[PDB]
Amino acid sequence: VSMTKTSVDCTMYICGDSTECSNLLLQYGSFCTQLNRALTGIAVEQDKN
């Protein structure tokens, strides 16, 4: 009926505790937000199901 809800902090996965990596991740624009939107879409719908 459901699966485990997950949420992934896209900056902390890629660039964990690093400011330099964080300033470089900004060069890929919305990609991390798109990932968190998609996981929030899945995770809200496990409570719908």
């Binding site: 485990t4 997950t6 996965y13 496990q46």
Partner: protein, 49 residues
């Protein structure tokens, strides 16, 4: 059915230290990989049932 986490109040009390090591989830949490709780507890599912 034997689960690996469900967002059951992680509090670095058992994670930080001996239990950061042997735990898929402690490595999950520390890297932005979080598991969220369902909206309905296993008691509320049982009341509807």
């Amino acid at each position: 059915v034997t689960l690996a986490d469900a967002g059951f109040i992680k509090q670095y009390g058992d994670c930080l230290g001996d239990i950061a090591a042997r735990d898929l989830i402690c490595a999950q949490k520390f890297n932005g990989l979080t598991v969220l709780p369902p909206l309905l507890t296993d008691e509320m599912i049982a009341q509807y049932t």
